[PDB]
């Protein structure tokens, strides 16, 4: 459905003069993960506050979930939901109604109308300069899965094995994650915006729409180019 | 929608007297419509406006480093933001569009209003003078005042009460800082 | 040229 990137549309890693570590931390071992939770508070008309305690490191007590519009916030306002996605700490501001906190965009799927007995595996096809490089499987325990959840799991493997994001830069020039669903398709830019600084909130903002895809009909492919 | 509404307002006013010579910072804490707590650079400390603003003033006056930051804010915040926007806020100059036309279709010997439409200008400082065949006319000057459009432009309608005889020349003089010489638009009866 | 903002203070509790 969405057209493929233009010859100059993709972000180049060579143009980025900052630190790739700020991008790597989002797709590292740490992420917000909660099973069957309801929103305790609300900061603004487009967001929701969930009480999720960090047990792995202990960096957060409350998580802010932002959306593109007011309609998305009122939809998951009372219903018991499943939270998954990459979180940021810098430039994350909100106040709970009467201490350590984190912020994120979308990544919410209803608990009642979902969940699976067996872990569904989705095949990933990684391409280096249009040519096949490697292939791996991504596991999930839900039918309707957010685009953020699948994007995080795919990047986490590529950071650990193929080393997608390093401390200073990346071994690949351009990169984009493609999600194909029967006739409809959509893509997200993997590389950061050009400059000396990387904004975590501005980049993670692409998940505010809360795009969901069915695990049974979803196909995922990664396209990256060398320097 | 019958549910009640609650509003909290915070305003940081930077008052500039004679350019930059005298700077006054005014912090204002407003609940609904009534102002509770305020700070003034001329005072140097937080002073309560209402009874609800009393514990906030005492809490903020106890800490010497909060007050020091607010006192230094006339230079680090007020004087700083003035110089940043100086090229597009203070020094903004837009030439006005002057148009002279009668209010209604009326023949000679009978009264009519001469509309001197002056629109799209910055700043608001303007001097509109009426002339009857070279001589200044101060009587019967109906002005709508200064209207702010919101898009950094101003508009004013200055009307003159006249009784055209035959071939009288009515000139509208417009004085604005954007123009070196005053703009004059003439209308013949 | 950067615009500077004033930090809001928390009320007494």
């Amino acid at each position, epitope marked *: 459905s969405q057209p493929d990137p233009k010859p100059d549309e993709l972000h180049k890693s060579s143009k980025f003069t*900052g*630190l790739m*570590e*700020n991008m790597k*931390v*989002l797709y590292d071992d*740490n992420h917000v993960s909660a099973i069957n939770v309801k929103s305790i508070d609300q900061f603004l008309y487009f967001d929701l506050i969930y009480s999720i305690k960090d047990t792995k*490191l*202990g*960096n957060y007590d409350n998580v802010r979930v932002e959306f593109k519009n007011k309609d998305l916030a009122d939809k998951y306002k009372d219903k018991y939901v499943d939270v998954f996605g990459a979180n*940021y*700490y*810098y430039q994350c501001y909100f106040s709970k109604k009467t201490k*350590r906190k984190t912020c994120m965009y979308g990544g919410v799927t209803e608990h009642n109308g979902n969940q699976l007995d067996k872990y569904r595996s989705i095949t990933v096809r990684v391409f280096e300069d249009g040519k096949n490089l490697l292939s791996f499987d991504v596991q999930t325990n839900k039918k309707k899965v957010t685009a953020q959840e699948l994007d995080y799991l795919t990047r986490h493997y590529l950071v650990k094995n193929k080393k997608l994001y390093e*401390f200073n830069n990346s071994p690949y020039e351009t990169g984009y994650i493609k999600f194909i669903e029967n006739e409809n398709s959509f893509w997200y830019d993997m590389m950061p915006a050009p400059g*000396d600084k990387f904004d*975590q909130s501005k980049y993670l903002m692409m998940y505010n729409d809360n795009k969901m895809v069915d695990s049974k009909d979803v196909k995922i492919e990664v396209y990256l180019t060398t320097k | 929608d019958t549910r009640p509404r609650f509003l909290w307002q915070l305003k940081f006013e930077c008052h500039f007297f004679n350019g930059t010579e005298r700077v006054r910072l005014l912090e204002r804490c407003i609940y609904n419509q009534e102002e509770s707590v305020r700070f003034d650079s001329d005072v140097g400390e937080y002073r309560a406006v209402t009874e609800l603003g009393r514990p906030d003033a005492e809490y903020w006056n106890s800490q010497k480093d909060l007050l*020091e*930051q607010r*006192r*230094a804010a006339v*230079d*680090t915040y007020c*004087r*700083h933001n003035y110089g940043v926007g100086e090229s597009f806020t203070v020094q903004r100059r837009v030439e006005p569009k002057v148009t002279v036309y009668p209010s209604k279709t009326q023949p000679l010997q009978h009264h009519n209003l001469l509309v001197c439409s002056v629109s799209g200008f910055y700043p608001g400082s303007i001097e509109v003078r009426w002339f009857r065949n070279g001589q200044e006319e101060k009587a019967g000057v109906v002005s709508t005042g200064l209207i702010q459009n919101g898009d950094w432009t101003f508009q004013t309608l200055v009307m003159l009460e006249t009784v055209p005889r035959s071939g009288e020349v009515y000139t509208c003089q417009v004085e604005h800082p954007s123009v070196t010489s005053p703009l004059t638009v003439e209308w013949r009866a | 040229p*950067k615009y*500077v903002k004033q930090n809001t203070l928390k009320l007494a509790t």
Partner: T-cell receptor
Amino acid sequence: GITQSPKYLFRKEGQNVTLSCEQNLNHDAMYWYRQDPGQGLRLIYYSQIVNDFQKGDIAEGYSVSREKKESFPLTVTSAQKNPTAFYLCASSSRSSYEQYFGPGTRLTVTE
Amino acid sequence: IQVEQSPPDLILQEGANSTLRCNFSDSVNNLQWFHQNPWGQLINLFYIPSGTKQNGRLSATTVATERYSLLYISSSQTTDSGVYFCAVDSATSGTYKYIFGTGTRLKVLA
């Protein structure tokens, strides 16, 4: 307070060394500096909060980690031409804004 | 961005008074005053981006418009000996990017 372990470090040319820095002051901002004999403090890398990373003057050849709000270690790679320096870790207050320094670490690298 | 401390070296007697100056090329949001003891431990003296503060025998003043900072040491003690640093956070680029000065070498003669 702020802790820097060990007090003295020694490694040969080519080897990688990780310098530890810990604080229980609950500060978000953490810093890494290096001091040469008779010289001043040169900023390497700094973190404003957990998962945030910023560059400094002498950043090349070094790498930092920030997974938790307590620890911020500095790794010295073989890429650094002159690694022999007195490394100092710092932490800025959230409310007072005061920068507090640790004991420091003396590192010596020889071929 | 550019920090210059004057004097580079200062020799004082026990119980003497002297002022230490720190000059910076740009406008600063945050300023720090340090005292590095002969062993290398940096002792935080003052956080003074503007105004005047007092801490025992030591006093500090900063003028943001004039772009300089002063550090007054009354009744010099033998333990005050070492290097005095002036760290500044420039508004031109980056928040909390503290740049340290050349330093004032103090030798208090007992």
